Structures are given as C-alpha cells and as structure tokens.
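Exercise (ungraded).
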Amino acid sequence: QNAQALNTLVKQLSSNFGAISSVLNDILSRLDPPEAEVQIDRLINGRL
Amino acid sequence: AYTNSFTRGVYYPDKVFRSSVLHSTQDLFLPFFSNVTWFHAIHRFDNPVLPFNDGVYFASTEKSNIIRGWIFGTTLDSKTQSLLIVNNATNVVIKVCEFQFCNDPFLGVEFRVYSSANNCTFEYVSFKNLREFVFKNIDGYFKIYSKHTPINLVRDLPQGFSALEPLVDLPIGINITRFQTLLALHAAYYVGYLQPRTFLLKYNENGTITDAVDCALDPLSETKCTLKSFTVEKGIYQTSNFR
Amino acid sequence: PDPSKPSKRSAIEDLLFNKVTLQKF
Amino acid sequence: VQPTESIVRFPNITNLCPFGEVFNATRFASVYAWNRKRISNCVADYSVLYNSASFSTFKCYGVSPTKLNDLCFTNVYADSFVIRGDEVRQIAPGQTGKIADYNYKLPDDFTGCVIAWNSNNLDSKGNYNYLYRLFRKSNLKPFERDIYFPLQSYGFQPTNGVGYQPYRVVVLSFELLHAPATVCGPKKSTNLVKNKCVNFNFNGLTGTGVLTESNKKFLPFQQFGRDIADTTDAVRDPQTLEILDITPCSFGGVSVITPGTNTSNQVAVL
Ligand SMILES: *[C@@H]1O[C@H](CO)[C@@H](O[C@@H]2O[C@H](CO)[C@@H](O[C@@H]3O[C@H](CO[C@H]4O[C@H](CO)[C@@H](O)[C@H](O)[C@@H]4O)[C@@H](O)[C@H](O[C@H]4O[C@H](CO)[C@@H](O)[C@H](O)[C@@H]4O)[C@@H]3O)[C@H](O)[C@H]2NC(C)=O)[C@H](O)[C@H]1NC(C)=O
Ligand SMILES: *[C@@H]1O[C@H](CO)[C@@H](O[C@@H]2O[C@H](CO)[C@@H](O[C@@H]3O[C@H](CO[C@H]4O[C@H](CO)[C@@H](O)[C@H](O)[C@@H]4O)[C@@H](O)[C@H](O[C@H]4O[C@H](CO)[C@@H](O)[C@H](O)[C@@H]4O)[C@@H]3O)[C@H](O)[C@H]2NC(C)=O)[C@H](O)[C@H]1NC(C)=O
Ligand SMILES: *[C@@H]1O[C@H](CO)[C@@H](O[C@@H]2O[C@H](CO)[C@@H](O)[C@H](O)[C@H]2NC(C)=O)[C@H](O)[C@H]1NC(C)=O
Ligand SMILES: *[C@@H]1O[C@H](CO)[C@@H](O[C@@H]2O[C@H](CO)[C@@H](O)[C@H](O)[C@H]2NC(C)=O)[C@H](O)[C@H]1NC(C)=O
Ligand SMILES: *[C@@H]1O[C@H](CO)[C@@H](O)[C@H](O)[C@H]1NC(C)=O
Ligand SMILES: *[C@@H]1O[C@H](CO)[C@@H](O)[C@H](O)[C@H]1NC(C)=O
Ligand SMILES: *[C@@H]1O[C@H](CO)[C@@H](O)[C@H](O)[C@H]1NC(C)=O
Ligand SMILES: *[C@@H]1O[C@H](CO)[C@@H](O)[C@H](O)[C@H]1NC(C)=O
C-alpha cells in the first residue's frame, strides 16, 4: 500500500491539468511572464 | 486466400530507450490473430490497386528478388503527385512526382512501369528470406519500418515474436490513398491493415521488445492490461464498465 | 540466538526475514 | 548542491535558412490556393523579422518573439499569399469569415507566428490575378487547400482604401515532433564537463544534474533513455554521438541539535 501510494504521487507529476505542457522549463523558455503566470497557476493547483 | 496473422507486426513506436519495464502505449497496430489477405500477384495475373486506409503491413518470402518496389498514390497518373520507390541492385531510388503510369506497371528487365513523368519535387538515393515492412503516412511523414528474419515459410506466416525497427523517415506531405507493388519481368505476398489500438510492450534489459499483449483481444487480455502484468493470480477482478 | 552467526538471530527469525520483499530529485 | 557551470551542445549545421525566398519574393499566390514551403536543416535568425522595417502585423502564438532565437524545431513551414487590407484579421485561430471559413482555416491549437506586410506598390494594377473563394457547402478544415462561381477576383488598384490594398502575409507554423531538431538558430556550443553539478542544454533537452560516462546500449536510431517513472536517464552527444549518464544533485534536510538555552549556546548540525 505504501509503495502504491508513493508511485501514484510520483506519476501525478506528468499530468497536464489544461496547460500547454507539463514542464516548467519548457513554458519558461517559450512564453512571456504575463501568460506563463496563468498556466503555471494551473499546474500549481494540480500539484497541490 | 486467407491465413492467420498470429503475433506479427510489432514495431518500436518511439526513439526512447527503455529496459526491464512493461510500458503501455497507443498507436496503429496490426490486431492479433487477424485473417491476413494472401495474394498471388502472378500465378495468370491479378495485381490490383489496393486501398491504403491508415497503413499497410507488408510481408513476403522470396529469393529471386521479383519484388523491387511499390507504387503509392491516389490517381496513379500524371494528374497529381505519386510516390515511386525502386530497390536497385546497388541503391534505392526514392522519388515522388506525377507519373502517368501504365496499365501493367513493372520494371523492364527499359521502363514499362510508367509512360511519362514530369513536374518532380523530391529525389533521394541511399531460402529462409522473410521480409517484413510497415508503411505509414502521418502528419505528411512517410515512415518505413523493417526487419529481416530467416523464416523458411512461403505459403503462410510463422509463429513467434520479432520487433520491427525504423528504417527511413521521409518529410514529404504526399497524399496517398492507394498502393501497388512493383514486379520485375524478363510472386506471392501478404497485405494487412493497421488499426488504432493499445498494447502492453515488454522490454528486455537491452531495450529489446520481447512480448506484447493486445488489450482488446479477450477478457484475459483486459485483465492483464489492467493489472500491468503478464501473469494473473487466482481471484476475481473488475476490469471495465458496460452500457 | 545462534552464537555462530554474525547476526544474533534465531533460525526462525532468519526464515522470517527472508520472506518479506522488498524519485529523490 | 548548487550548479557550477553550463554545458551547451548543438548539431552539425552551417547552412542558412532560405527565408528570403519568400520574404523577398516578388510573386505571391492567390489567397484561395496558398503556397507552402518547407524550411529545414539550416540556421534560422528571426531577429531580422523582429527588426524588419515596415512590418505591419507581427504576433507570435504560444511563443514569444524575443525568445524565438534560442529555440529548436523539427521543421518550420512558411506559407505565402496576398490578402486585402481588411481581411487580415481573418487569419487567426477562432476567427470566422469568408476567408477564414472558405479559403484557409487556421487551427485553434496552432503554434507559430503570423506576419503581414502591405504590398500595394508591388501588386496593385485592378490586379485580378488574385482570387478569393466565396462559396462552400461547408467550412474548410485546418490547413486545407480546396481549389454563383466560387472564385472572385480582387480589386487591387492604386488609390484604393488601405483596407482594400493588397497585403503580403506569411503564416509560419512551428512543429515540435519527436524527431531530432533540424532548425536550431545561432548559438555557441562548448565541451563536456563530467562529475559536476552543471546546467544542461542538449537541444532540445535541457536540465541540470551530474554527467558521467554512460554504458547503456542504445540502438543506432535511439536518442534518449528513460526510467521506470518516465524520467530522463541518458542523452546522446549532438556532436560526438556518445551516451551520457545523468544523476541528480544531492539534497536533504538540515536539523539542529541543541540542549536548552538555559545551559549552553552551542549546537550541532546534521
Ligand atoms: C542482453 O545483453 C546481455 C549482455 O549484457 C546478453 O548476454 C550475453 O549475450 C552474449 C551473446 O551476444 C553472450 O556471448 C556468448 O556467450 C557464449 C557462452 O558464454 C559462456 O562461455 C564462454 C566460453 O568462452 C565464456 O567465456 C563465457 O564467460 C560464458 O561462460 C559464448 O560461447 C559465445 O562465444 C562465441 O561467440 C563469440 C561472438 O563474439 C565469439 O567471439 C566466440 O569465439 C565464440 O564463438 C558468446 O561470447 C554472453 O555470454 C552473454 N552474457 C552472459 C553473462 O551470459 C544477452 O544475450 C542479451 N539478450 C538479448 C535478448 O539481447
Ligand atoms: C531583401 O533582403 C535583404 C536582406 O537579405 C534586405 O536588405 C535590407 O533592407 C533593409 C531595408 O528594408 C535595410 O535597412 C536599411 O538599411 C540601410 C542601409 O543603407 C546604408 O548602407 C548601404 C549599404 O548596403 C549604403 O549603400 C547606404 O548608402 C547606407 O550607407 C539604412 O540606411 C536604413 O536606415 C534608414 O531607414 C530606417 C528604417 O527603419 C530608419 O529608421 C533609419 O533612421 C534610416 O533612415 C535601414 O536600416 C537593411 O540594412 C538591408 N540589409 C542588408 C543586409 O542589406 C532587403 O530589404 C530585402 N528586399 C525586399 C524587397 O524585401
Ligand atoms: C540502378 O543502378 C544502376 C547502377 O548499377 C544505375 O545506373 C547508374 O545510375 C546513376 C544514377 O544515380 C548514374 O549516375 C550512373 O551513370 C548510372 N550508371 C550506369 C552504368 O548506367 C541505374 O540508374 C539504377 N536504376 C534504378 C531504376 O534504380
Ligand atoms: C559538425 O561540425 C562540428 C564543427 O563545429 C564538427 O567538429 C569538428 O569538425 C571538423 C570537421 O568538420 C573536425 O576536423 C574537427 O576535429 C571537429 N572538432 C571536434 C571538437 O569534434 C563536428 O565533428 C561535426 N559533426 C559531424 C557529425 O560531422
Ligand atoms: C478470415 O476471415 C475472413 C472474414 O474476415 C473470412 O472471409 C476468411 O475465410 C477467414 N479465413 C480463415 C482461414 O478462417
Ligand atoms: C487525397 O486524394 C483523395 C482522392 O483519392 C481525396 O479524396 C482526398 O481528399 C485527398 N486528400 C488530400 C489531403 O489531398
Ligand atoms: C508542370 O507543372 C506546371 C505548373 O506547376 C504546369 O503549368 C505544366 O503544364 C506542367 N507540365 C507537365 C508536363 O506536367
Ligand atoms: C530557564 O529557567 C527559567 C527559571 O529559572 C525558566 O522560567 C525558563 O523557562 C528556562 N528556560 C529554558 C529554555 O528551559
């Protein structure tokens, strides 16, 4: 049970949550701050 | 004629190395245990223009190299583009353009393949004899996978597992809806069709694919795909929902 | 406890401890 | 552990991209039958388009224009045509209209750029050689080129309204496929540093970690390695085609051991 819980927690790190990508470096290297903030907010909510 | 496909037509779906893991993927695959079309192009000859659909699994067993290429295109005339590939004795002539093809196209061994060619845009140069191919046209890319295996069977398909590897990638954008094979005249082969399906792929420690599971073949396969394993213990398991 | 082994375990404890098996960044 | 250096590697490219074949061209196709060009295997500099004089529309979707000189792409598609001054707005995702629905549907999930230029001094005659399609039984799909009569000729004439003058517009579509990058842009590559926490740039993969010599047996077509949790584990060298092993920098928690303050003021750290 403990191993399964940890595995699920780790796998939830590759989800999109409605953003354009699941990588912070990608969106930081592609977009400008004003909209990067919105999509980073979406990712933050999912991870929380 | 019809025969059994067994477990043939598995190819590497990505350029990512993996080892000692069971990975689930979705792509266009040849469904397991399907009834594959068996053809005698010339026995008397019937070598027609077959639809391409979403892809073609091509496999044949030959020694005399009677098969030398294929014709890809929608109209197969000089009106619009068409792809022509020829397996030379020294290279490959990969070239696509309008080709007012002949009613009985074949390499003159002169060019009895086609009558006229013009307006060309691209050109590329680069018995236990079982040859296997996978041809796809996605996003305008023409992808070719292949694998050569010593199988002593001509009139059927063998049993076992072997994974096809990428051979050529072509950024063309050509519109293809039909295809036809080239023959050399001074010829038996098979044609399958790929479908959207999900598979469970087993990777050896060296990155070699060694086993697979068709997730929609039967209830036991659904159970195996759900539990992420190739062995199932005793008991009852809930697999899906109906409606 | 078995005095002849580096780990001061009995035989039954040794049997028990061999049946249970078995991301930083 | 903080990183110390940065590692940058780029592929074998010296060719320049043929942007001038379209941007400097003198012949432009009709809006109903567009001209598509494939650009690849070259260095691309977008600062000239960013700094181009007399540019009217320059809007990047999903990328920022200033950060476009540091990215790499599988391929870039350049498409050219001439449009009216008033019809420029229709070339955008989520837009409807005569051209947007009957000439060229720009997809909603499109990534790339759109650039428009006024071409009255070069195309105006009335130049009826440019035709815009007016009738369909259904709206066009994205990237489709379908070629009362459906086609109508443009009134590109001198002294016409600026919203009716011919406009040269180029649609740049950027693609990010699994294939290794072909269009990279100008950047200087360095050598390899081993056994240190460093910053990584093996285009298009970036990250941080520790590089050692990998003994993984990649296949010739194989570029990347991944772990059980779908995490990067190996990379190929863009210039020497060698496998490199990745290990994260060490980290952990810091705790302070202390007796009461009433007795001492010295502590130990774990
Ligand atoms: C996944 O990858 C692993 C490696 O990590 C593979 O395991 C090795 O596979 C190779 C096959 O390519 C094996 O090599 C062969 O081993 C035979 C038996 O080895 C024993 O006997 C020899 C006798 O000298 C001993 O030295 C050895 O230590 C073993 O005790 C050898 O008889 C073979 O030699 C013959 O072929 C070579 C080819 O180069 C000739 O040069 C020789 O002269 C001779 O004719 C050969 O060396 C290797 O043994 C495997 N490793 C282990 C530890 O067993 C997996 O096979 C691979 N799996 C997949 C699916 O890819
Ligand atoms: C085809 O593609 C080429 C490049 O591949 C383009 O060439 C560029 O054209 C632009 C104009 O659109 C140039 O920008 C201008 O450059 C002028 C340079 O003139 C000096 O240098 C030449 C030598 O070539 C001398 O003969 C000349 O006497 C000058 O000493 C500048 O003078 C311009 O500055 C003026 O205009 C700007 C407008 O923004 C004002 O802000 C300034 O204050 C000033 O008044 C201007 O900078 C650019 O330099 C060219 N590049 C190259 C490499 O040649 C073509 O334009 C393009 N053609 C088409 C039709 O698309
Ligand atoms: C098949 O291969 C032969 C070579 O064995 C080709 O003949 C050569 O083709 C090249 C074209 O790349 C020419 O440059 C040479 O001059 C040719 N040599 C001779 C002796 O003819 C032939 O064209 C190939 N044909 C096909 C259909 O693949
Ligand atoms: C791609 O180009 C780079 C140049 O930046 C090559 O690196 C040098 O290539 C020349 C030949 O063009 C060699 O003589 C040098 O010895 C190379 N230097 C180093 C440090 O490697 C690089 O080899 C090229 N890549 C390929 C695959 O050809
Ligand atoms: C395979 O199935 C097809 C129908 O899908 C059938 O026509 C054919 O006879 C079958 N062949 C065999 C060997 O069962
Ligand atoms: C490809 O050709 C067929 C005709 O065989 C046509 O129906 C189809 O619309 C064409 N597709 C494209 C993308 O041109
Ligand atoms: C070649 O294509 C051009 C237009 O691209 C056309 O005008 C010409 O008639 C074509 N000729 C042949 C022989 O196909
Ligand atoms: C130190 O001692 C005083 C009484 O002498 C007490 O009030 C205080 O809480 C003590 N502080 C600590 C850290 O133990």
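Further reading is listed at the end of the chapter. For now, observe: The interface with chain D takes residues 7, 10-11, 14, 20, 25, 29-32 of chain A (CB under 8 Å). Residues B 2, 35 surround 2-acetamido-2-deoxy-beta-D-glucopyranose (ligand 5) (CB under 6 Å).
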